[PDB]
Ligand SMILES: CS(=O)(=O)c1cccc(Nc2nccc(Nc3c(Cl)ccc4c3OCO4)n2)c1
Ligand SMILES: [Mg+2]
């Protein structure tokens with residue numbers, strides 16, 4: 001959806017993205033009430049391939065409609081700067097949000113966040129969309145603490161292309177996906193387990209100061225991240241289920257959502273901690 005630039009008012013720069021700024025603004029179109037939007041801008045000094053790469057995130061987002069997937073409002077392409085407009089998520093990225101609020105949300109709140117993420121992924125998997133970069137930094141959070149999946153793009157990672165998407169995010173990535181570049185919804189399930197750990201650790205870095213190769217070797221040698229402080233054992237076990245070496249043994253997203261919904265219904269089960 002092409003958005004007339006006169007409909008857009010940019011209010012403040014709130015972030016930086018790969019190709020330029022991220023801003024908060026307002027969108028007002030004839031016949032509709034004004035709404036708050038995030039705006040990614042792409043200014044001069046870019047190649048056409050880069051412009052197409054930029055806008056591809058819009059194309060992809062525009063293919064989806066789900067309350068736990070960032071909603072596209074439109075694009076500005078017939079003037080400068082080139083812009084992508086989405087719904088505005090007041091609390092930004094989940095990892096930084098949790099770090100800011102370390103220890104200040106209950107287990108049930110955190111499980112609700114995880115459920116929202118899992119429902120977003122359930123939807124993507126149903127649509128045969130493999131995310132490939134599922135990580136707490138790519139989950140955005142609104143004023144009601146609703147979590148939505150962001151970061152959409154289909155570019156092969158640097159390792160998949162010519163000898164001579166960015167690099168594979170090793171700490172989030174399933175071992176078969178690192179080794180063979182086989183990215184499936186089941187490798188996304190591995191990543192989801194990492195996101196669970198991030199959330200229950202209030203945004204600690206997965207594997208602390210281990211090197212990428214240290215992480216690769218540890219996982220091959222049966223190491224798995226331990227339960228975060230005060231983490232319910234049932235959640236840690238769901239993480240371990242997500243981190244099965246055999247991708248076919250991992251829960252699919254409908255099962256993940258089901259598991260989390262049961263926890264929510266039976267919050268006594270979450271009292272058991274190591
Ligand atoms: C807490 S805060 O108000 O300071 C704040 C900081 C950064 C981002 C957001 N909030 C935020 N809300 C929605 C989207 C985005 N970033 C984003 C993505 Cl991830 C992908 C595509 C597009 C985006 O903006 C438009 O096109 N960000 C809010
Ligand atoms: Mg990505």
Ligand SMILES: [Mg+2]
Pocket residue numbers: 133151
């Ligand atoms: Mg990415």
Ligand SMILES: [Mg+2]
Pocket residue numbers: 102201202229
């Ligand atoms: Mg801590």
